[PDB]
Design a protein around this nucleic acid. Structure first.
Lengths: 130, 259, 89, 148, 178, 133
RNA sequence: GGACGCCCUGCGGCCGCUCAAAAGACCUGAACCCGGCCGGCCGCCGGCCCGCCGGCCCCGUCUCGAAACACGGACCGAGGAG
RNA sequence: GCAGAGGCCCCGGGGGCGAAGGCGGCGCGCAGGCCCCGCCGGACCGGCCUCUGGUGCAGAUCUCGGCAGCAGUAGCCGCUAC
């Protein structure tokens, strides 16, 4: 339930890079699109404009993909699939998939408890006693 | 499709768009229009069949058969080979006309775990595949190549098992999924006639064998190659800038006398 | 776009959307072989001892390009027939 | 095929690689190889010399088989001899029993002399021969011969 | 911030790897590149790069070219990074050791019948990796028909030939025609 | 697999057959396993359901025994006697819960005279099959 | 395909009933838009407890050059072009 | 990222012990996007390799469907009259 010590995770931008003019219109969805217009204030990056997605914003390769608990995520759907986490994956942690039913989640969690593998969603679908 | 309507453009000056419109002004004959033709309609004149030269279509079968001889490739293709006594496996099997008897040979030769992994695999596929006569997907497993035997009647119903005559081996069966390594159960007659089939491939010489990756590591590790190896010159020590003036020791690396 | 391009000797498609139908698709190829085999098999059954093919002569392939090769020709001359003493009937 | 194509990577780019100032329009330069002597003269002269004009006597029906004359070379006569046969012929020399190669049978009509025959008498039977063929054939000791 | 365009002629791309799906070629390139890195010999550097070249760059050397090229040095092993094709025009082939990526069936038989050896790049790596008593030989790269038609036929100093039949007299009958 | 290419394995074509079948085909399609006592007696595994048949439903809701009183061919469902939907008020007509014929096993049959002949016709064809078809 | 009780002049309300569920004239039920309650004071970006300070013209488009008093675009969903 | 095909998913992938989808909220990714969680929903769904495309929208006086402000607005002023 405890990971390797690891180096402080630093995120260059907390916010999510909304597309330009996505607030003004519901039709423009907030998913980022490169600004590609002849007179686009966003592509000219004039003062006051939203920020632009670039590789400079990339996180440290060593701490990238790591979750706040200092663990990396492997999405498990079965007890055989707990063999990736079994092969000395002291760095990774297990997420059970959304499809997996509570019947199967109980079996997966017991195998994880024996292995010592940490399960991120260990309260999922645990509604009283079925 | 989309062109049985009679639509002509209303034109500029009616405050409408310029696309073809029918009698009431309903948009028509355009990819954007509802009921319009596709912009570039699919055609039956597409080339569906690609061309392969006999020599390469005979290299593919041979290389796939070579993968079958390789247990490591056969395990990677998803087959259960733990109990199979040898790979490649050759089993004497006089005509088997009964599925029960065929299964009894499969149980003895240790291919049964693979035949079961196919039976249990039967499921309903996701998508419109279900609607379009492709409802059930079963994992593919043993392949029974036969000659001078009626083993087909016996193994046909077994789930996941495909049967082919030596004379006409199929690459798609040999490499299901474009992955080499189908488990092949060879009947004594078929495996002992394999060299005859290739000999009767007329002017065909089997592709000459090449080296493997394991054999080139050994060859590289051989003393002759190692003797030629010369030790590389020692690398530069990059270090990092420091202010030499502040530290007596830092100046000493550059100015021993001054400090 | 240009540079050195050999020019095309292809002819422009005619009657593409209206006309006689100048496109022959060959999806009927696998099934034409089957139909033709069956017709031969049924004709063969109709005359079991008789061969499907009549004896036809050995004739020189026409032209100087194939002078020294022989091919099968439509039929025996009446002089060839008199060498074996057989009437045309 | 379609997935690994350039036009799939031009989505979101508007013009699709054809330019804002002049876009893809239908037939901007014309249809076909039209303009050869006018608007495209520079191309039809830079890369197509001889495109315009008439250059020779015209045969209304060329007879493709009277015209066909296949050729051999004094260098490839001995590759026509089967390999097992060729070695014995080479060592023996045998002016008495030298291998007659009827090139007509192998599909060739005229014997040219591109390279060099081995030094063994041969005898080559053909419809026609070059000058430096007969010179090379007769130096080796072989006799040029004509076959019906 | 930094003018780095005044005297720099720009990066030049080269084949640092073999684009071949063929496993054996990738396995040999890696094998000889490892030798070159450990032992910095020109023969292994030229071989490393020759393996990465494309099929058009690597032309066939015939058994009549190799015979002529190795006439003075029959002892030296003739290393070809393409295919040896037989020349039936050369009735008698001389005996030599040859190491090529491929050898045609006729060319494997002819050399073996002569008493020569058809070695392979793996046999070379095992026997003479650095290249002792070996010569790297190449086929004619301009032998390609496409190479012959590159240029501007119709220009006065082209000496090229037009792509296609043409069949007309303008520009073709002389420097003054047209 | 099926070697008679004349038959259809298309989901659409097969479903159309079920949904839009002639009555004579609908009746055979609506058939039920005979009890093991009747299987020994008549030597036939399944008979098409009639009106006067005592049947045991081994289904989930409405499992029970009853005599069929209505055969609804268009819905492909039969109504035994006894098995009915819960009634909102005691003073109301009982509504039979429609049960599939495949969900039930026959315990008694209406022998008639045609049913006796039909059991005989099938018995003869089954005997020929048992004699190595 | 809506038990029964209640209140209706009645329309119809209500309580609940049948059902696994109303799924109640119909599967799921989005966006636009709207009404009740319920906070808040108002767009984007950045800082901070978060309402103040600082930056911030309307995009697409041809165009030497568009916030343009150039053009198209009320809004939203689906379809829509190498 | 999408939709299909041929495979794989170590006792034979995940599913009424709840599929797809819808709605909110975390996490992860430079981002395209992905994952999970609660809720609604009520039968299907994929990850990976190889394969195929009628494969991704803000615009086109775009098509078709819905629908807003305007707006309880302009109007309901021929034929004498109740």
């Amino acid at each position: 339930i405890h990971p390797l010590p690891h180096k402080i995770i630093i995120k260059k931008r907390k916010n999510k890079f909304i597309r330009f003019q996505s607030e003004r219109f519901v039709r423009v969805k907030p998913s980022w699109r490169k600004p590609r217009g002849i007179d686009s204030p966003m592509r000219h990056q004039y003062r006051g404009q939203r920020p632009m997605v670039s590789i400079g914003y990339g996180s440290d390769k060593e701490t990238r993909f790591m979750l706040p608990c200092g663990f990396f995520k492997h999405r498990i759907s079965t007890v055989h699939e707990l063999k990736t986490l079994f092969m000395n994956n002291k760095t990774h942690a297990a997420q059970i998939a959304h499809g997996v039913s509570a019947r199967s989640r109980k079996q997966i969690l017991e195998e994880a408890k024996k292995m010592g593998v940490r399960v991120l969603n260990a309260d999922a679908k645990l509604r009283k006693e079925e | 499709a989309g062109v049985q309507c009679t639509a002509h453009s209303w034109g500029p000056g009616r405050a409408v768009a310029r696309l073809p419109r029918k009698h009431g002004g309903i948009g028509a004959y355009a990819n954007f229009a509802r009921g319009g033709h596709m912009a570039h309609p699919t055609t039956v004149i597409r080339r569906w069949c690609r061309k392969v030269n006999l020599n390469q279509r005979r290299y593919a079968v041979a290389s796939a058969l070579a993968a079958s001889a390789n247990a490591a490739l056969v395990e990677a293709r998803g087959h259960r080979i733990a109990d199979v006594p040898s790979i490649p496996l050759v089993v004497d099997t006089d005509n088997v006309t009964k599925t029960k008897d065929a299964l009894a040979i499969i149980k003895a030769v240790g291919v049964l775990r693979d035949v079961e992994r196919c039976k249990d695999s039967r499921h309903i596929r996701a998508g419109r595949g279900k609607m379009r006569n492709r409802r059930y997907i079963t994992r593919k497993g043993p392949l029974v190549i036969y000659n001078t035997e009626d083993v087909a009647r016996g193994f046909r119903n077994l789930p996941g098992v495909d049967l082919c005559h030596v004379s006409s081996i199929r690459l798609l069966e040999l490499a299901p999924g474009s992955h080499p390594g189908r488990l092949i159960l060879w009947t004594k007659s078929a495996f002992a006639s394999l060299d005859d089939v290739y000999a009767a491939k007329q002017n065909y010489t089997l592709p000459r064998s090449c080296i493997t990756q394991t054999d080139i590591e050994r060859i590289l590790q051989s003393d002759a190659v190692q003797k030629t190896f010369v030790p590389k010159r020692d690398p530069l020590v990059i270090e990092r800038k420091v202010d030499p003036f502040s530290s007596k020791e830092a100046l000493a690396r550059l100015d021993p006398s001054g400090t | 776009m240009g540079r050195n391009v050999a020019f095309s000797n292809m002819r422009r498609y005619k009657c593409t959307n209206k006309g006689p139908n100048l496109i022959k698709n060959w999806f009927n190829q696998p099934a034409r072989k089957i139909r033709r085999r069956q017709t031969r098999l049924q004709k063969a059954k109709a005359i079991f001892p008789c061969p499907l093919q009549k004896l036809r002569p050995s004739v020189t392939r026409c032209s100087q390009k194939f002078n020294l090769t022989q091919r099968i020709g439509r039929g025996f001359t009446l002089r060839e027939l008199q060498g074996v003493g057989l009437s045309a009937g | 095929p379609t997935r690994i194509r350039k036009s799939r990577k031009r989505r979101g780019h508007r013009q699709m690689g054809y330019g804002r100032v002049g876009g893809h329009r239908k037939h901007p330069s014309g249809r076909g190889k039209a303009g050869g002597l006018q608007h495209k003269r520079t191309s039809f002269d830079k890369y197509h010399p001889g495109y315009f004009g008439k250059l020779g006597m015209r045969n209304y029906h060329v007879r493709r088989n009277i015209e066909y004359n296949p050729t051999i070379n004094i260098d490839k006569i001995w590759s026509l001899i089967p390999e097992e046969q060729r070695d014995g012929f080479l060592q023996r020399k045998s002016t008495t029993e030298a291998p007659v190669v009827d090139v007509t049978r192998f599909g060739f009509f005229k014997v040219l002399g591109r390279g060099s025959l081995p030094q063994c008498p041969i005898i080559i039977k053909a419809r026609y021969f070059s000058s430096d063929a007969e010179k090379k054939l007769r130096e080796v000791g072989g006799v040029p011969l004509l076959v019906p | 911030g930094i003018d780095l365009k005044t005297g720099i002629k720009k990066r030049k791309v080269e084949r640092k790897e073999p684009k071949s799906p063929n496993p054996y070629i990738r396995l040999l390139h890696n094998a000889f590149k490892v030798v070159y890195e450990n032992t910095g010999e020109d023969f292994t550097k030229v071989l490393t790069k020759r393996l990465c070249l494309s099929k058009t760059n690597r032309p066939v050397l015939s058994v009549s070219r190799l015979a002529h090229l190795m006439h003075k040095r029959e002892d030296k092993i003739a290393v070809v990074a393409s295919t040896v094709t037989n020349d039936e025009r050369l009735v008698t082939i001389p005996r030599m050791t040859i190491c090529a990526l491929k050898f045609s069936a006729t060319a494997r038989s002819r050399i073996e019948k002569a008493g020569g050896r058809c070695m392979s790049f793996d046999e070379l790596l095992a026997e003479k990796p650095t290249g002792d008593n070996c010569v790297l030989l190449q086929g004619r790269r301009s032998c390609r028909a496409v190479c012959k038609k590159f240029g501007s036929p119709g220009r006065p100093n082209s000496h090229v030939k037009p792509k296609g039949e043409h069949k007309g007299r303008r520009g073709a009958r002389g420097r003054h025609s047209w | 697999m099926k070697l008679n290419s004349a038959v259809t394995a298309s989901r659409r074509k097969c479903r159309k057959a079920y949904f839009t079948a002639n009555a004579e085909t609908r009746a055979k399609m609506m058939s039920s396993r005979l009890s093991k006592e009747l299987r020994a007696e008549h030597k036939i595994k399944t008979m098409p359901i009639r009106r006067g048949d005592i049947v045991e439903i081994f289904t989930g809701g409405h499992k029970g025994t009853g005599k069929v009183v209505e055969v609804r061919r268009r819905d492909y469902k039969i109504c035994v006697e006894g098995i009915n939907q819960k009634a909102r008020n005691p003073e109301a007509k009982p509504v039979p819960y429609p049960i599939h014929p495949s969900n039930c096993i026959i315990k008694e049959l209406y022998m008639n005279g045609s049913r006796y002949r039909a059991i005989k016709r099938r018995q003869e064809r089954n005997a020929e099959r048992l004699a190595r078809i």
